[PDB]
Each structure stands twice: as C-alpha cells, then as structure tokens.
Amino acid sequence: TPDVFISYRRNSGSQLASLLKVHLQLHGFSVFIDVEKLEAGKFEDKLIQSVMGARNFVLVLSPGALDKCMQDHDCKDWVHKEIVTALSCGKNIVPIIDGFEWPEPQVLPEDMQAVLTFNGIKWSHEYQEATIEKIIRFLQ
Amino acid sequence: TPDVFISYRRNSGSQLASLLKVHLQLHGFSVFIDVEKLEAGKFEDKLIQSVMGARNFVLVLSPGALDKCMQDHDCKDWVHKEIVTALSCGKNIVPIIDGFEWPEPQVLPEDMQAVLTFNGIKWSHEYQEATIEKIIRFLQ
Numbered sequence: 001t002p003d004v005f006i007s008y009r010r011n012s013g014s015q016l017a018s019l020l021k022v023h024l025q026l027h028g029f030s031v032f033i034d035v036e037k038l039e040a041g042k043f044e045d046k047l048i049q050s051v052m053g054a055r056n057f058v059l060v061l062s063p064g065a066l067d068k069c070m071q072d073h074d075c076k077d078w079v080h081k082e083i084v085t086a087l088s089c090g091k092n093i094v095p096i097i098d099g100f101e102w103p104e105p106q107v108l109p110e111d112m113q114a115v116l117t118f119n120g121i122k123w124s125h126e127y128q129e130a131t132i133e134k135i136i137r138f139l140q
Numbered sequence: 141t142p143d144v145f146i147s148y149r150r151n152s153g154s155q156l157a158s159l160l161k162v163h164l165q166l167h168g169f170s171v172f173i174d175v176e177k178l179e180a181g182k183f184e185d186k187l188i189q190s191v192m193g194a195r196n197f198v199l200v201l202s203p204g205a206l207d208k209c210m211q212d213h214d215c216k217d218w219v220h221k222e223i224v225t226a227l228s229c230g231k232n233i234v235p236i237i238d239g240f241e242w243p244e245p246q247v248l249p250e251d252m253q254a255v256l257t258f259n260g261i262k263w264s265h266e267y268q269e270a271t272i273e274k275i276i277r278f279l280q
C-alpha cells in the first residue's frame with residue numbers, strides 16, 4: 001500500500017502534482033497518482049481503496065480546484081470523492097496552496113467542509129526545496 | 141557551467157519548467173533555471189551569459205508562452221531575449237510542447253521566427269517518463 005495519495009485537478013494542477021510525486025519519491029515515499037498507479041478494473045473501486053490505503057493525502061490546491069465540488073450534491077466529482085474518503089478514514093490530509101483562494105465553508109458540500117480546517121502549505125516557486133522539506137515534515 | 145538552460149513563462153510554465161529541472165538533474169545534467177541559479181548582479185547580463193554557456197536550450201512552450209514576444213520590436217521581453225541568444229549562438233534548442241498552438245511565423249519578430257523550425261517534443265501527462273527519456277535523447 002502506497003503511503004502518499006496525490007489528489008489534484010487534471011486541469012490546473014497536473015504539473016505541480018507530478019512535480020510533487022517525483023519529489024516525494026526522491027525522499028523515499030511510496031506515491032499514488034492516477035496516471036501512474038491507477039491500473040486495471042473499475043476505477044471507482046480502486047481509487048477509493050488507494051485513498052483508503054494511504055496514510056498521507058496530499059491535496060493540490062491549484063486555482064479554482066474545488067469549483068467542481070461546489071453544488072456536487074450527489075458526490076460525483078472525483079476530488080470531492082477523494083476528500084470525503086480521506087476525511088472519513090482520518091487521513092493525514094496535507095493541502096498544497098498554489099494561487100488558491102479559500103472558499104467559505106457554506107459554498108461547499110457539508111461532507112467535505114472539514115477540508116478547510118487542515119493547515120495548508122503555500123507553494124513557493126522561488127523556494128521549492130524549502131517547500132518540499134516542509135511538505136515532508138508534514139508527512140507521517 | 142551548466143549544460144541545460146530552461147526558458148519558460150512564469151505564469152503558465154513555472155511548474156513544468158521546475159519538473160524539467162528536477163528530472164534533468166536526476167539524470168546528471170547541470171541545469172540552469174532562474175529561480176535556483178540566477179544570482180547576484182545585473183540580471184540582464186547574468187541571464188544572457190547563462191544561455192551562452194549552456195550547450196542545451198530547453199524552451200517550455202506552455203499555453204500562450206510566445207504571446208508577449210509578439211510585436212516586441214526592441215527585444216525587451218525576456219523569453220524573446222533568451223530565444224534570440226540561443227538562435228544566434230546555434231544552440232541545441234529543444235522545445236517542449238505543453239498545450240501550445242504553433243503561431244504563424246510572421247506574427248513573431250523576425251529575429252526569433254527560426255525557433256519554430258526546431259523539432260518539438262510533446263509533453264504527455266500520461267506518459268511523463270517516456271517524455272523525459274525522449275528529452276534526454278535530444279540533449280547533447
């Protein structure tokens with residue numbers, strides 16, 4: 001079971017999320033990201049089990065990354081599905097802030113509002129190695 | 141003196157450029173990117189000199205990356221300046237295509253139109269490892 005699951009938006013967070021996978025793998029962590037570890041079968045099943053098997057949940061807060069979550073009242077958006085699982089299993093959630101504006105809780109679905117209550121890490125283009133060291137201090 | 145100079149747009153390519161840095165150093169290339177290796181002094185000469193010392197010139201073509209070069213007569217846009225140096229020095233230009241649309245050459249200033257004649261490498265989120273290896277094979 002991989003120890004770090006990376007959840008992100010294919011849209012605005014694909015590059016950071018891959019740059020995080022590499023960096024954590026360089027420091028020895030076993031990393032799940034979809035385009036490399038999501039393999040055969042029913043992905044709904046397997047993605048949820050990958051969040052369930054990972055002690056660490058790294059969530060890439062790229063600009064507008066929770067917009068598709070807002071008014072996803074039937075829990076059919078995939079960042080929404082991943083966050084709820086992580087909160088449900090008590091995972092060490094670690095958000096990564098990259099030009100992300102914090103929603104008010106009320107605009108998000110109730111089952112994922114708790115994600116705003118975790119200390120996030122601001123991504124610094126100018127000080128990436130320090131940001132990586134900080135992200136790794138946060139990992140368990 | 142570094143072997144590889146990375147040219148990029150801070151607002152669209154900052155992540156892929158940093159992703160390219162980490163991977164290339166991993167493979168043992170000495171990589172120049174401004175955030176890590178631009179240092180004291182007048183940047184307008186430190187920058188041009190570093191393009192001149194690197195055999196390889198890697199150009200991150202994120203979306204819109206050459207836009208601010210358009211109509212830049214007096215060569216004051218930095219992507220424009222870095223590109224013209226690579227062309228005038230006969231550098232090993234390896235463009236990286238990240239959702240970039242090829243402009244018609246005549247929208248670009250005359251002194252960088254030739255940059256379009258080089259073989260670009262398409263960045264594949266799904267096949268990042270394959271993409272990195274192809275980049276290495278292009279490098280001298």
Ligand SMILES: C[C@@H](c1cc[n+]([C@@H]2O[C@H](COP(=O)(O)OP(=O)(O)OC[C@H]3O[C@@H](n4cnc5c(=O)nc(N)[nH]c54)[C@H](O)[C@@H]3O)[C@@H](O)[C@H]2O)cc1)N(C)C(=O)NCC(F)(F)F
Nearest residue numbers: 006007008009010011034035036038039043078079082266
């Ligand atoms: C459903 C989709 C998916 C997987 C993981 N996630 C997690 O949820 C977050 C990202 O979600 P996003 O909201 O940012 O983007 P999306 O919702 O649009 O994703 C779906 C989009 O990909 C394309 N698309 C759709 N269907 C398939 C498919 O069968 N096969 C392939 N190759 N592409 C497919 C299409 O373009 C579509 O629109 C992340 O945290 C993921 O971990 C979300 C969605 N999926 C199965 C794959 O990708 N499989 C390839 C991979 F990942 F294994 F390499």
Ligand SMILES: C[C@@H](c1cc[n+]([C@@H]2O[C@H](COP(=O)(O)OP(=O)(O)OC[C@H]3O[C@@H](n4cnc5c(=O)nc(N)[nH]c54)[C@H](O)[C@@H]3O)[C@@H](O)[C@H]2O)cc1)N(C)C(=O)NCC(F)(F)F
Nearest residue numbers: 126146147148149150151174175176178179183218219222
């Ligand atoms: C002029 C600027 C620069 C350097 C290299 N390049 C190459 O040219 C391409 C970039 O393309 P861009 O179109 O994005 O450039 P820009 O005009 O937008 O940059 C302006 C933005 O940078 C910030 N800004 C501006 N002025 C300073 C400054 O004195 N001091 C610090 N700390 N930040 C500064 C600010 O945020 C601003 O708004 C790349 O290929 C670079 O290699 C372009 C511009 N510069 C000196 C730095 O950055 N130095 C910090 C560094 F790079 F060492 F980390």
